[PDB]
Design an enzyme around this catalytic site. Structure first.
Site, mmCIF file in Angstrom:
data_model
loop_
_atom_site.group_PDB
_atom_site.id
_atom_site.type_symbol
_atom_site.label_atom_id
_atom_site.label_comp_id
_atom_site.label_asym_id
_atom_site.label_seq_id
_atom_site.Cartn_x
_atom_site.Cartn_y
_atom_site.Cartn_z
ATOM 1 N N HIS A 61 13.804 -15.639 -5.011
ATOM 2 C CA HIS A 61 14.758 -15.703 -3.900
ATOM 3 C C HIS A 61 14.037 -15.714 -2.548
ATOM 4 O O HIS A 61 14.649 -16.019 -1.532
ATOM 5 C CB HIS A 61 15.783 -14.574 -3.884
ATOM 6 C CG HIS A 61 15.258 -13.182 -3.985
ATOM 7 N ND1 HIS A 61 14.900 -12.422 -2.893
ATOM 8 C CD2 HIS A 61 15.036 -12.393 -5.066
ATOM 9 C CE1 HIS A 61 14.475 -11.227 -3.281
ATOM 10 N NE2 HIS A 61 14.548 -11.194 -4.596
ATOM 11 N N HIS A 91 8.309 -10.162 3.407
ATOM 12 C CA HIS A 91 8.870 -11.404 2.901
ATOM 13 C C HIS A 91 9.614 -12.065 4.057
ATOM 14 O O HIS A 91 9.718 -11.446 5.107
ATOM 15 C CB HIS A 91 9.793 -11.205 1.686
ATOM 16 C CG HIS A 91 10.957 -10.322 2.055
ATOM 17 N ND1 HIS A 91 10.913 -8.958 1.870
ATOM 18 C CD2 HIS A 91 12.160 -10.608 2.617
ATOM 19 C CE1 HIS A 91 12.062 -8.439 2.302
ATOM 20 N NE2 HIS A 91 12.828 -9.431 2.749
ATOM 21 N N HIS A 93 12.946 -14.902 5.299
ATOM 22 C CA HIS A 93 14.188 -15.629 5.074
ATOM 23 C C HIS A 93 14.144 -16.839 6.003
ATOM 24 O O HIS A 93 13.667 -16.712 7.150
ATOM 25 C CB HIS A 93 15.423 -14.782 5.398
ATOM 26 C CG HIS A 93 15.433 -13.465 4.654
ATOM 27 N ND1 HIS A 93 16.166 -13.356 3.481
ATOM 28 C CD2 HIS A 93 14.833 -12.283 4.904
ATOM 29 C CE1 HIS A 93 16.004 -12.098 3.027
ATOM 30 N NE2 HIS A 93 15.204 -11.456 3.880
ATOM 31 N N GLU A 103 18.571 -13.756 9.491
ATOM 32 C CA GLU A 103 19.643 -12.915 8.965
ATOM 33 C C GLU A 103 20.336 -12.200 10.123
ATOM 34 O O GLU A 103 21.540 -12.382 10.320
ATOM 35 C CB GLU A 103 19.072 -11.914 7.954
ATOM 36 C CG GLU A 103 18.522 -12.670 6.741
ATOM 37 C CD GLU A 103 18.608 -11.832 5.478
ATOM 38 O OE1 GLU A 103 18.038 -10.739 5.439
ATOM 39 O OE2 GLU A 103 19.269 -12.306 4.533
ATOM 40 N N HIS A 116 10.618 -9.766 7.237
ATOM 41 C CA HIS A 116 10.928 -8.368 6.955
ATOM 42 C C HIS A 116 9.695 -7.648 6.434
ATOM 43 O O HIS A 116 9.207 -8.082 5.393
ATOM 44 C CB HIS A 116 12.060 -8.293 5.911
ATOM 45 C CG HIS A 116 13.358 -8.750 6.500
ATOM 46 N ND1 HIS A 116 14.449 -9.087 5.744
ATOM 47 C CD2 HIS A 116 13.696 -8.891 7.809
ATOM 48 C CE1 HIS A 116 15.438 -9.425 6.564
ATOM 49 N NE2 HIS A 116 14.998 -9.327 7.814
ATOM 50 N N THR A 195 19.399 -6.494 2.392
ATOM 51 C CA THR A 195 20.244 -7.678 2.567
ATOM 52 C C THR A 195 20.287 -8.518 1.277
ATOM 53 O O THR A 195 20.891 -9.590 1.290
ATOM 54 C CB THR A 195 19.809 -8.572 3.728
ATOM 55 O OG1 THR A 195 18.487 -9.056 3.465
ATOM 56 C CG2 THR A 195 19.740 -7.788 5.050
#
Ligand SMILES: [Zn+2]
Length: 257
Positions: A61, A91, A93, A103, A116, A195
């Protein structure tokens, strides 16, 4: 299983994880005019000079860089935190397009990606125990905007080729996460959640005001990763971000005026 596509994306998560409709979910929109400046907040203390990175992994993911957290090597203290939090992984997003991917948002503004850095409170002895406590995790959120390349990110971009599909990992030693920090450590902070499932409400969020810039070429490489495992039909790893959740009974505090 959960993911970010139309039949298993964020709007569906509450059926397997009902805390998705919880009181302190993340991310949120940061309304800069209603955030309260708090002179009581301390500067952040980031001590990353002894960090030991071990591995980079495509977990299906996102991709994450993992650190040795068996000792107080890379820790976050200060700011709104009580106690010492050790870095365990970072990591990202990101979006399918430069105008989306973060996010958190700032006055509804979306950034191209969000980093993050996840830390856990050493009082609870291990990560798995920390995520069960309301003050178990501290996550440093950094926005990425597209512009000039970030030299310290290139080592990461260069190894993505080798972990393109889910479950792939590679040795990734001697990476210094200081090269990912902006110049200023001014921040917003609020109590929230992971999240991604299981969406536990165990996080003190610390979101830095200043974004870092990365080049289009660097985020392009993020978008070549895959959600699928090797041999499965290709699905590009893009738009792995959860939309903003209701702030509810919470106050965002700012460390700056
Ligand atoms: Zn994250």
């Amino acid at each position: 299983h959960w993911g970010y596509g139309k039949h298993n994306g964020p709007e569906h998560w509450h059926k397997d994880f009902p805390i998705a409709k919880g009181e302190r979910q993340s991310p949120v929109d940061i309304d800069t005019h209603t955030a309260k400046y708090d002179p009581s907040l301390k500067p952040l203390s980031v001590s990353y000079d002894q960090a030991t990175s071990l591995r980079i992994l495509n977990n299906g993911h996102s991709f994450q860089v993992e650190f040795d957290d068996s000792q107080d090597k890379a820790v976050l203290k200060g700011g709104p935190l009580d106690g010492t939090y050790r870095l365990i992984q970072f990591h990202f997003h990101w979006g399918s397009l430069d105008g989306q991917g973060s996010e958190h948002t700032v006055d509804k503004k979306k950034y191209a990606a969000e980093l993050h850095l996840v830390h856990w409170n050493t009082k609870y002895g291990d990560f798995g125990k920390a995520v069960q406590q309301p003050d178990g995790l501290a996550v440093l959120g950094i926005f990425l905007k597209v512009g000039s390349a970030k030299p310290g990110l290139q080592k990461v971009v260069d190894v993505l080729d080798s972990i393109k599909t889910k479950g792939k990992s590679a040795d990734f030693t001697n990476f210094d996460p200081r090269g990912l920090l902006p110049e200023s450590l001014d921040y917003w902070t609020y109590p929230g959640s992971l999240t991604t499932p299981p969406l536990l409400e165990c996080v003190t969020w610390i979101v830095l005001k200043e974004p870092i810039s990365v080049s289009s070429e660097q985020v392009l490489k993020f978008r070549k990763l895959n959600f699928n495992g090797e041999g499965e039909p290709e699905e590009l790893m893009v738009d792995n971000w959860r939309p903003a959740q209701p702030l509810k009974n919470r106050q965002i505090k700012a460390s700056f005026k």
